[PDB]
Design a protein around this ligand. Sequence first.
Ligand SMILES: [Ca+2]
Length: 508
Amino acid sequence: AFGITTSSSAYVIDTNAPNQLKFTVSRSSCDITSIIHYGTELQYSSQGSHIGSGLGSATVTATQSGDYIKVTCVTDTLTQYMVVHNGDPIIHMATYITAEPSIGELRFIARLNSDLLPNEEPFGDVSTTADGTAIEGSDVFLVGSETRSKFYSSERFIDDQRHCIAGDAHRVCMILNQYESSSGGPFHRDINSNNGGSYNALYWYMNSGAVQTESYRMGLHGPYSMYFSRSGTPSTSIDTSFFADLDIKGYVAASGRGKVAGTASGADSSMDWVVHWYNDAAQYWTYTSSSGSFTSPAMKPGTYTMVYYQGEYAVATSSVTVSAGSTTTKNISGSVKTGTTIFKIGEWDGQPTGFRNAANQLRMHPSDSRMSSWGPLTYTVGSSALTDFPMAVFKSVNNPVTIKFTATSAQTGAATLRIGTTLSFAGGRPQATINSYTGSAPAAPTNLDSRGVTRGAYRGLGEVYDVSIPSGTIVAGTNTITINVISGSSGDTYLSPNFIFDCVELFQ
Ligand SMILES: [Ca+2]
């Protein structure tokens, strides 16, 4: 029957789902200590499913409100909610914070039976580290001859509405339709799952320090839903609007929200367009249609910075104000401006898309034998393919990158060499030499204080470095460009100072 079973140590919640879903919440810690789906225990026995590594101690209450059950867990700076609806095999959750947890990240981890749930979806065993020997920190491993990491399960938050772990008789999915209180914008990615040897972890990283570009946000994180299936795959269309009737701290209902609608125009039509709204309280995003038409998600009232991207490259920024119950009409327009192009390597999309090893880097370590050679490589304009240009240059692996190009007599005037990047590590930035002319050494970029390129990430501050080339420095015939990564810092192989390329363009 739908309801709550009370004992001194626990509340047992029965969702009354057709294929059965019951779970046990500790009244001492708020740990989920047992999960019964279709007559089968799914919870790892030695450690609970919980926020972080566990709340430790919490004040736990459980109440039925019509066809809903709410479990509330109160600590000093965090309130954890679990909500179920009669008939649905779902544990709906939301996490209210007034301060960032001590550890400096905010996550929910489900530690589940890896014999019953061995697989990870949608990316497969790239994040399966079971039987692995560590090759970097405590988070990148070699399993046989293949490099593996929990980070290789990651996906851009804009595209991460569902990820799962699964077996032949059970599937458990996170359904994530509310990233408003997260950090780092639409293109932030984070740890999704990890079959690590003792159990298979299913995550939602609400926020973290992994390649983090923004301050953390307080208030209500989520809702988020953990769906339990036999062999079905749940739709991401899951109503959580009933949260409005449960006195959930920090919850703002549809009625307390407004929208921004309009048309974006002017950017590169060969790329997907994204519009992004943010302030200290909340962040929102949407893809536009091919015509540039967009409507924001339902937004908390206030004033927002508004950004228009082609791919992940920002072409325009504006400001907009949102009021509850109202749609603000606001257009946005912009384009990437350079000049008369001599050569262009890559595209202005804020990504290393198309570069050597770019596709592999999302799902394996740079040291993996399946990677193509990092270099040092010589790229020759008009002969080399884009997949012959390294997605990243490391001070102590493939430094420097050499570019050969042909110029006509008409192209010997003044020019700008533009070196667009996505993400730096350990102070890495380019210094360029063109023939016998050496550009200035740019200062160190802002340190993001985390690994990235070795953990399937690339979305940084997107620093762009221009080098002014005087007239008569470019010559008719063959020219040589050398791109060195410089930094006062040092490291072994892929942990040496480095940056990931976005685009390299020479224009006049
Ligand atoms: Ca690019």
